[PDB]
């Protein structure tokens, strides 16, 4: 599913990301934009052999099982394919664990490089929240 920005804002808000660990909703929408282009089906192989999955590009190195990432963990206790569903519940629950882990949203490289320090509220401009 390719979400619209306001559609995604509403879903992320429904699921409790607005202000989760102090990160406003616009941070999460901006992160999804630059991680996945709002596409729940996005997958990207990393140089270490892990893969990033879904709307928030959750990595198989730590967070989910894909069966092809040796010596990895599954700390969200989910198959990585769950993270590609049109329903973002599993991605949001896992993102809440990731952002709690110690470096906050710096776990998302696109957030750090493209959203952090910017006017992230623009990403929710005009949305009915």
Q: Tell me the three-class secondary structure of 13-39, residue by residue.
A: HHCCCCCECCECHHHHHHHHHHHHCCE
Any contact of residue 91 with Na ion (CB under 5 A)?
no
SS3 label, residue 109 = helix
46 vs 121 by CB, closer to Na ion: 46
Binding region for Na ion (CB under 5 A) out of 15-23, 60-68, 90-98, 102-110: 60-68
For residues 69 and 60, the answer to whether their CB atoms sit within 8 Å is yes
CB atoms within 10 A of CB 45: 11
Closest approach, Cβ 65 to Na ion, in A, equals 5
**Is 35 an active-site residue?**
yes
Any contact of residue 51 with Na ion (CB under 5 A)?
no
Which residues contribute to the site for Na ion (CB under 5 A)? 60, 65, 69, 72, 74
């Amino acid at each position: 599913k390719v979400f619209g920005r306001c559609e995604l804002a509403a879903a992320m808000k429904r699921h409790g990301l607005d202000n989760y660990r102090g990160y406003s909703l616009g941070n999460w929408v901006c992160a999804a934009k630059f991680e996945s282009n709002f596409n729940t089906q996005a997958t990207n192989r990393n140089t270490d052999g892990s893969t990033d999955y879904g709307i928030l590009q959750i990595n198989s190195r730590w967070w989910c099982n894909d069966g092809r990432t040796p010596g990895s963990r599954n700390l969200c206790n989910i198959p990585c394919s769950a993270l590609l569903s049109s329903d973002i519940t599993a991605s949001v629950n896992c993102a809440k664990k990731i952002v709690s882990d110690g470096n906050g949203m710096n776990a998302w490289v696109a957030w750090r490089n493209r959203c952090k320090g910017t006017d992230v509220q623009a990403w929710i401009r005009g949305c009915r929240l």
